[PDB]
Design an enzyme around this catalytic site. Structure first.
Site, PDB file in Angstrom:
ATOM      1  N   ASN A 149      -2.281  41.724  27.899  1.00  0.00           N
ATOM      2  CA  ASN A 149      -1.107  42.768  27.676  1.00  0.00           C
ATOM      3  C   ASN A 149      -1.630  44.171  28.295  1.00  0.00           C
ATOM      4  O   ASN A 149      -1.494  45.251  27.506  1.00  0.00           O
ATOM      5  CB  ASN A 149      -0.718  42.816  26.394  1.00  0.00           C
ATOM      6  CG  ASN A 149       0.694  43.577  26.284  1.00  0.00           C
ATOM      7  OD1 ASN A 149       1.523  43.217  26.876  1.00  0.00           O
ATOM      8  ND2 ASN A 149       0.836  44.286  25.234  1.00  0.00           N
ATOM      9  N   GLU A 183      -1.538  39.599  33.145  1.00  0.00           N
ATOM     10  CA  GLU A 183      -1.024  41.137  32.762  1.00  0.00           C
ATOM     11  C   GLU A 183      -2.102  42.109  32.840  1.00  0.00           C
ATOM     12  O   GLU A 183      -2.311  42.710  31.786  1.00  0.00           O
ATOM     13  CB  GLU A 183      -0.348  40.929  31.498  1.00  0.00           C
ATOM     14  CG  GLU A 183       0.945  40.102  31.507  1.00  0.00           C
ATOM     15  CD  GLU A 183       1.837  40.271  30.222  1.00  0.00           C
ATOM     16  OE1 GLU A 183       2.554  39.396  29.901  1.00  0.00           O
ATOM     17  OE2 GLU A 183       1.743  41.450  29.536  1.00  0.00           O
ATOM     18  N   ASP A 202      -0.441  31.988  31.569  1.00  0.00           N
ATOM     19  CA  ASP A 202       0.677  32.108  30.621  1.00  0.00           C
ATOM     20  C   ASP A 202       1.863  31.252  31.313  1.00  0.00           C
ATOM     21  O   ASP A 202       2.313  31.799  32.078  1.00  0.00           O
ATOM     22  CB  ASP A 202       0.862  33.647  30.463  1.00  0.00           C
ATOM     23  CG  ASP A 202       1.979  33.965  29.372  1.00  0.00           C
ATOM     24  OD1 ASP A 202       2.512  32.974  28.922  1.00  0.00           O
ATOM     25  OD2 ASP A 202       2.166  35.026  29.026  1.00  0.00           O
ATOM     26  N   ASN A 231       4.563  30.617  29.651  1.00  0.00           N
ATOM     27  CA  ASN A 231       5.527  31.272  29.050  1.00  0.00           C
ATOM     28  C   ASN A 231       6.777  30.236  28.440  1.00  0.00           C
ATOM     29  O   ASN A 231       8.105  30.504  28.220  1.00  0.00           O
ATOM     30  CB  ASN A 231       6.521  32.374  29.951  1.00  0.00           C
ATOM     31  CG  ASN A 231       6.179  33.676  29.552  1.00  0.00           C
ATOM     32  OD1 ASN A 231       6.053  33.908  28.430  1.00  0.00           O
ATOM     33  ND2 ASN A 231       5.955  34.498  30.659  1.00  0.00           N
ATOM     34  N   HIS A 280      -1.284  38.045  22.753  1.00  0.00           N
ATOM     35  CA  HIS A 280      -1.877  36.589  23.226  1.00  0.00           C
ATOM     36  C   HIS A 280      -3.403  36.650  22.752  1.00  0.00           C
ATOM     37  O   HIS A 280      -3.857  37.869  22.787  1.00  0.00           O
ATOM     38  CB  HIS A 280      -1.822  36.274  24.682  1.00  0.00           C
ATOM     39  CG  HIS A 280      -0.326  36.073  25.335  1.00  0.00           C
ATOM     40  ND1 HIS A 280       0.246  34.956  25.806  1.00  0.00           N
ATOM     41  CD2 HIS A 280       0.603  37.089  25.195  1.00  0.00           C
ATOM     42  CE1 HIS A 280       1.436  35.141  26.052  1.00  0.00           C
ATOM     43  NE2 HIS A 280       1.719  36.402  25.758  1.00  0.00           N
TER      44      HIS A 280
HETATM   45 MG   LIG Z   1       2.570  41.472  27.684  1.00  0.00          MG
END
Ligand SMILES: [Mg+2]
EC number: 4.2.99.18
Length: 256
Positions: A11, A37, A150, A152, A247
């Site tokens: 993130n 990310e 990820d 998702n 995460h």
């Molecule tokens: Mg994020």
């Protein structure tokens, strides 16, 4: 010889750096670290985040500033990396980094979030389709493949805290779950579930107060391998205790 691979949606790399990233990295000592990310062009990064002693780093930013981006730190460099499927709209979002390690290709993928609009859900589903074509081509050509990142999407009811409430939310739609089924059916294995059949095992929690503390989470991050390669997988686990993002990291140990 065992090879430890870690995958982590951080993130924002500059953000996780403020929340203990380097200290964690030095403790865990993986052979390969895959990040999603990054939200940074490598030029925006401090030297000590760019160059971590003992590792070669490779960054794949999105065209859009401060958005998406993937990276890989590795003790041994790959022969090269590929940053797309050969489809423009999928290749310019800093989502794809495919490293050729000889014994295997390592796909480090940040799959699209489909929650914000119908158009982005369509984008997610078409990205899934392009990915499957790509991995199948490589696998069919005789390559062993490891896929992390990820996705998702939570695969089954066991993979999130609130399956009923999320059955009409991207992340747990029937169409997305069906794609994961199809992916696996094409000859790939969800490695975590080779070793762990327990509920409550998530990799992502909202920042909404108490979500992580109440374990109201989703398993969105996976390591997959082709079936022919699964015998080399020794461990696949979640580093649930590691903070600094919405995460947590996941781990794979293989021995070739
Ligand atoms: Mg994020």
């Amino acid at each position: 010889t065992v090879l430890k691979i870690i995958s982590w949606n951080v993130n924002g790399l500059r953000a996780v750096h403020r929340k203990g990233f380097l200290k964690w990295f030095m403790e865990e000592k993986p052979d390969i670290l895959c990040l999603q990310e990054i939200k940074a062009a490598p030029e925006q990064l401090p030297r000590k985040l760019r160059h971590v002693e003992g590792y070669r780093s490779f960054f794949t930013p999105a065209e859009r500033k401060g958005y998406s981006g993937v990276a890989m730190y590795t003790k041994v460099p790959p022969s090269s990396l590929r940053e797309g499927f050969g489809v423009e709209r999928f290749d310019t979002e800093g989502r794809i980094q495919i490293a050729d390690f000889d014994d295997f290709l390592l796909y480090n993928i940040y799959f699209p979030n489909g929650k914000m609009s119908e158009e982005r859900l369509k984008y997610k589903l078409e990205f899934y389709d392009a990915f499957l074509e790509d991995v199948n081509r490589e696998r069919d050509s005789g390559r062993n493949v490891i896929i992390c990142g990820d996705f998702n999407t939570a695969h089954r009811e066991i993979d999130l805290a609130r399956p009923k409430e999320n059955s009409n939310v991207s992340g747990f739609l029937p169409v997305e779950r069906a794609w994961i089924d199809k992916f696996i059916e094409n000859g790939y294995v969800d490695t975590f579930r080779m070793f762990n059949s327990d509920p409550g095992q998530y990799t992502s929690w909202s920042y909404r107060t108490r979500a992580r503390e109440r374990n109201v989470g989703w398993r969105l991050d996976y390591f997959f391998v082709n079936e022919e390669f699964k015998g080399k997988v020794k461990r696949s686990w979640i580093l649930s205790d590691v903070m600094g993002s919405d995460h947590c990291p996941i781990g794979l140990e293989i021995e070739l």
